[PDB]
Protein backbone atom coordinates (compact mmCIF):
# COMPACT_ATOMS: atom_id res chain seq x y z
CA UNK A 1 0.00 0.00 0.00
CA UNK A 2 1.01 3.62 0.48
CA UNK A 3 0.32 6.69 2.56
CA UNK A 4 -0.32 8.40 -0.68
CA UNK A 5 -3.11 5.80 -0.36
CA UNK A 6 -2.57 3.97 -3.63
CA UNK A 7 -1.36 0.46 -4.24
CA UNK A 8 2.25 0.15 -5.36
CA UNK A 9 3.98 -3.10 -4.38
CA UNK A 10 7.06 -4.55 -5.98
CA UNK A 11 7.03 -7.65 -3.76
CA UNK A 12 6.42 -11.37 -3.66
CA UNK A 13 7.30 -14.42 -1.55
CA UNK A 14 10.60 1.94 3.16
CA UNK A 15 10.93 5.71 2.94
CA UNK A 16 10.48 6.21 -0.74
CA UNK A 17 8.95 8.19 -3.62
CA UNK A 18 5.36 7.71 -4.74
CA UNK A 19 4.43 10.47 -7.26
CA UNK A 20 1.43 12.19 -5.83
CA UNK A 21 3.08 14.88 -3.66
CA UNK A 22 6.67 14.60 -5.02
CA UNK A 23 7.63 13.43 -1.51
CA UNK A 24 9.06 10.17 -0.20
CA UNK A 25 6.86 8.22 2.21
CA UNK A 26 6.28 4.88 3.95
CA UNK A 27 4.42 2.39 1.73
CA UNK A 28 4.03 0.92 4.26
CA UNK B 1 42.00 -57.94 -25.03
CA UNK B 2 44.07 -57.00 -22.00
CA UNK B 3 44.60 -53.49 -20.65
CA UNK B 4 46.98 -53.54 -17.68
CA UNK B 5 48.50 -50.11 -18.36
CA UNK B 6 45.77 -47.72 -17.30
CA UNK B 7 45.08 -44.62 -15.22
CA UNK B 8 42.46 -42.36 -13.76
CA UNK B 9 40.43 -41.33 -16.80
CA UNK B 10 39.48 -37.76 -16.10
CA UNK B 11 36.98 -38.43 -18.98
CA UNK B 12 35.97 -41.60 -20.77
CA UNK B 13 35.23 -40.32 -24.29
CA UNK B 14 37.52 -38.34 -26.56
CA UNK B 15 38.04 -37.33 -30.20
CA UNK B 16 40.93 -39.28 -31.59
CA UNK B 17 44.26 -38.14 -32.82
CA UNK B 18 45.49 -39.45 -36.15
CA UNK B 19 49.10 -38.98 -36.94
CA UNK B 20 50.73 -36.70 -39.49
CA UNK B 21 54.51 -36.23 -38.91
CA UNK B 22 57.41 -35.23 -36.61
CA UNK B 23 61.02 -36.10 -35.79
CA UNK B 24 63.11 -35.86 -32.66
CA UNK B 25 62.96 -37.47 -29.24
CA UNK B 26 66.50 -38.81 -28.98
CA UNK B 27 67.70 -41.27 -26.35
CA UNK B 28 68.50 -39.94 -22.87
CA UNK B 29 68.47 -42.89 -20.47
CA UNK B 30 70.20 -45.95 -21.84
CA UNK B 31 72.53 -46.68 -24.72
CA UNK B 32 70.55 -48.72 -27.23
CA UNK B 33 67.06 -47.94 -28.36
CA UNK B 34 64.40 -48.65 -30.91
CA UNK B 35 63.11 -46.01 -33.30
CA UNK B 36 59.63 -46.23 -34.75
CA UNK B 37 59.61 -44.91 -38.28
CA UNK B 38 56.29 -45.25 -40.07
CA UNK B 39 52.51 -45.57 -40.37
CA UNK B 40 50.59 -46.60 -37.26
CA UNK B 41 49.57 -46.11 -33.67
CA UNK B 42 49.41 -48.52 -30.83
CA UNK B 43 47.56 -50.20 -27.99
CA UNK B 44 48.98 -51.24 -24.64
CA UNK B 45 48.51 -54.99 -25.12
CA UNK B 46 51.12 -54.92 -27.86
CA UNK B 47 53.63 -53.12 -25.67
CA UNK B 48 53.20 -55.64 -22.87
CA UNK B 49 53.91 -58.52 -25.26
CA UNK B 50 57.03 -56.78 -26.50
CA UNK B 51 58.15 -56.40 -22.91
CA UNK B 52 57.67 -60.11 -22.23
CA UNK B 53 59.96 -60.84 -25.16
CA UNK B 54 62.57 -58.27 -24.25
CA UNK B 55 62.71 -59.53 -20.66
CA UNK B 56 63.05 -63.19 -21.56
CA UNK B 57 65.76 -63.17 -24.20
CA UNK B 58 67.83 -60.99 -21.92
CA UNK B 59 68.86 -62.93 -18.90
CA UNK B 60 71.63 -61.27 -16.84
CA UNK B 61 68.87 -58.94 -15.88
CA UNK B 62 69.56 -56.19 -18.37
CA UNK B 63 67.71 -52.95 -18.13
CA UNK B 64 64.69 -51.82 -20.10
CA UNK B 65 62.46 -48.77 -20.13
CA UNK B 66 59.35 -47.66 -21.97
CA UNK B 67 59.55 -43.96 -22.71
CA UNK B 68 55.81 -43.73 -23.51
CA UNK B 69 52.47 -44.57 -21.91
CA UNK B 70 48.97 -44.66 -23.44
CA UNK B 71 47.16 -41.57 -22.22
CA UNK B 72 44.21 -42.00 -24.56
CA UNK B 73 41.22 -44.36 -25.00
CA UNK B 74 39.92 -46.32 -27.94
CA UNK B 75 36.17 -46.68 -28.19
CA UNK B 76 34.35 -49.41 -30.08
CA UNK B 77 30.73 -50.24 -29.67
CA UNK B 78 28.32 -53.20 -29.63
CA UNK B 79 28.34 -55.89 -32.22
CA UNK B 80 26.12 -55.65 -35.31
CA UNK B 81 24.43 -52.30 -34.66
CA UNK B 82 22.92 -49.51 -36.65
CA UNK B 83 24.93 -46.32 -36.52
CA UNK B 84 23.72 -43.11 -34.98
CA UNK B 85 23.33 -43.15 -31.25
CA UNK B 86 25.73 -42.02 -28.57
CA UNK B 87 29.42 -42.80 -28.76
CA UNK B 88 30.33 -46.20 -27.52
CA UNK B 89 31.97 -47.83 -24.58
CA UNK B 90 35.65 -48.29 -23.90
CA UNK B 91 37.78 -50.97 -25.51
CA UNK B 92 41.45 -50.11 -25.36
CA UNK B 93 44.02 -47.45 -24.72
CA UNK B 94 46.37 -45.73 -27.15
CA UNK B 95 49.87 -44.32 -27.35
CA UNK B 96 50.30 -42.59 -30.69
CA UNK B 97 53.58 -42.97 -32.54
CA UNK B 98 54.58 -40.48 -35.16
CA UNK B 99 57.80 -41.28 -37.03
CA UNK B 100 60.57 -40.39 -34.60
CA UNK B 101 59.52 -41.60 -31.18
CA UNK B 102 61.79 -43.98 -29.34
CA UNK B 103 59.64 -46.63 -27.74
CA UNK B 104 62.07 -49.08 -26.20
CA UNK B 105 65.50 -48.46 -24.78
CA UNK B 106 67.99 -50.62 -22.93
CA UNK B 107 71.45 -50.72 -21.44
CA UNK B 108 73.57 -53.02 -19.33
CA UNK B 109 74.27 -55.34 -22.27
CA UNK B 110 76.44 -55.41 -25.36
CA UNK B 111 75.51 -54.32 -28.85
CA UNK B 112 74.26 -57.71 -30.03
CA UNK B 113 71.70 -59.06 -27.57
CA UNK B 114 69.99 -55.70 -27.66
CA UNK B 115 69.69 -55.94 -31.42
CA UNK B 116 68.21 -59.43 -31.26
CA UNK B 117 65.59 -58.56 -28.65
CA UNK B 118 64.68 -55.53 -30.70
CA UNK B 119 64.20 -57.63 -33.81
CA UNK B 120 62.02 -59.90 -31.72
CA UNK B 121 60.05 -56.81 -30.74
CA UNK B 122 59.62 -55.12 -34.09
CA UNK B 123 58.14 -58.31 -35.48
CA UNK B 124 55.53 -57.88 -32.74
CA UNK B 125 54.42 -54.36 -33.61
CA UNK B 126 52.81 -52.62 -36.58
CA UNK B 127 55.45 -50.06 -37.24
CA UNK B 128 58.61 -50.49 -39.21
CA UNK B 129 61.64 -49.78 -37.07
CA UNK B 130 65.30 -48.84 -36.90
CA UNK B 131 68.17 -49.63 -34.54
CA UNK B 132 70.05 -46.77 -32.92
CA UNK B 133 72.97 -46.02 -30.67
CA UNK B 134 73.03 -43.24 -28.13
CA UNK B 135 75.94 -41.17 -29.40
CA UNK B 136 74.30 -37.80 -30.02
CA UNK B 137 71.21 -35.69 -29.46
CA UNK B 138 70.56 -32.64 -31.63
CA UNK B 139 71.04 -30.31 -28.67
CA UNK B 140 72.84 -30.34 -25.30
CA UNK B 141 72.27 -26.96 -23.57
Amino acid sequence: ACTECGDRNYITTMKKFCSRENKQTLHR
Amino acid sequence: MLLPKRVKYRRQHRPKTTGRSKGGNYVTFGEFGLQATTTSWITSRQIESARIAMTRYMKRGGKVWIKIFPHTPYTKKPLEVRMGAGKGAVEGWIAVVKPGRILFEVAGVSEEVAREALRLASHKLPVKTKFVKREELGGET
Partner: protein, 82 residues
Protein backbone atom coordinates in the same frame (compact mmCIF):
# COMPACT_ATOMS: atom_id res chain seq x y z
CA UNK C 1 20.27 -51.20 -32.47
CA UNK C 2 18.19 -48.04 -33.03
CA UNK C 3 16.86 -46.26 -29.96
CA UNK C 4 18.82 -48.21 -27.36
CA UNK C 5 19.20 -46.25 -25.11
CA UNK C 6 21.24 -43.23 -24.29
CA UNK C 7 21.78 -39.61 -23.66
CA UNK C 8 21.32 -37.25 -25.53
CA UNK C 9 23.63 -34.90 -24.06
CA UNK C 10 23.65 -31.95 -26.38
CA UNK C 11 22.04 -28.59 -25.79
CA UNK C 12 23.44 -27.13 -28.87
CA UNK C 13 21.68 -23.85 -29.76
CA UNK C 14 23.11 -21.56 -27.04
CA UNK C 15 24.23 -18.26 -28.55
CA UNK C 16 24.69 -14.63 -27.56
CA UNK C 17 26.88 -13.10 -30.32
CA UNK C 18 29.67 -11.47 -28.34
CA UNK C 19 32.91 -10.00 -29.55
CA UNK C 20 33.98 -6.65 -30.89
CA UNK C 21 31.80 -4.25 -32.83
CA UNK C 22 34.16 -1.42 -33.85
CA UNK C 23 37.79 -1.07 -34.85
CA UNK C 24 40.72 1.28 -34.56
CA UNK C 25 40.77 4.27 -36.84
CA UNK C 26 37.00 4.39 -36.88
CA UNK C 27 34.93 7.47 -36.26
CA UNK C 28 32.22 6.72 -33.77
CA UNK C 29 29.19 8.29 -32.20
CA UNK C 30 28.27 8.88 -28.59
CA UNK C 31 26.44 6.06 -26.85
CA UNK C 32 27.95 3.58 -29.31
CA UNK C 33 29.19 0.15 -28.31
CA UNK C 34 32.76 -0.86 -29.10
CA UNK C 35 33.22 -4.21 -27.50
CA UNK C 36 31.18 -6.71 -25.57
CA UNK C 37 32.91 -8.99 -23.13
CA UNK C 38 32.62 -10.37 -19.64
CA UNK C 39 34.60 -9.63 -16.57
CA UNK C 40 37.21 -7.19 -17.72
CA UNK C 41 38.82 -8.81 -20.69
CA UNK C 42 39.33 -5.17 -21.61
CA UNK C 43 39.37 -2.23 -19.26
CA UNK C 44 38.09 1.25 -20.06
CA UNK C 45 40.16 4.39 -20.22
CA UNK C 46 39.04 7.92 -20.89
CA UNK C 47 35.74 9.02 -22.40
CA UNK C 48 34.22 5.59 -21.65
CA UNK C 49 31.49 4.06 -19.52
CA UNK C 50 30.76 0.45 -18.63
CA UNK C 51 27.53 -1.34 -17.82
CA UNK C 52 25.79 -4.11 -15.95
CA UNK C 53 27.25 -6.82 -18.18
CA UNK C 54 30.75 -5.43 -18.64
CA UNK C 55 29.92 -3.91 -21.99
CA UNK C 56 31.78 -0.87 -23.18
CA UNK C 57 30.81 2.29 -24.96
CA UNK C 58 31.80 5.86 -25.59
CA UNK C 59 30.16 8.65 -23.65
CA UNK C 60 31.26 11.13 -26.33
CA UNK C 61 32.24 11.14 -29.98
CA UNK C 62 35.79 10.57 -31.13
CA UNK C 63 38.12 7.91 -32.45
CA UNK C 64 38.69 4.47 -31.00
CA UNK C 65 42.11 3.40 -29.80
CA UNK C 66 43.10 0.31 -27.86
CA UNK C 67 46.20 0.26 -25.71
CA UNK C 68 48.37 -1.76 -23.36
CA UNK C 69 48.73 -1.15 -19.65
CA UNK C 70 50.69 -3.75 -17.68
CA UNK C 71 51.87 -6.49 -20.08
CA UNK C 72 48.62 -8.45 -19.63
CA UNK C 73 45.51 -6.31 -19.70
CA UNK C 74 44.52 -3.81 -22.32
CA UNK C 75 42.31 -0.80 -22.37
CA UNK C 76 40.22 1.13 -24.84
CA UNK C 77 40.24 4.90 -24.97
CA UNK C 78 38.39 7.23 -27.29
CA UNK C 79 40.32 10.38 -28.07
CA UNK C 80 38.94 13.59 -29.42
CA UNK C 81 37.90 13.90 -33.02
CA UNK C 82 39.93 16.84 -34.25
Amino acid sequence: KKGVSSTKNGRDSESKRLGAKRADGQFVTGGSILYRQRGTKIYPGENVGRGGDDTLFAKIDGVVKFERKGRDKKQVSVYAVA
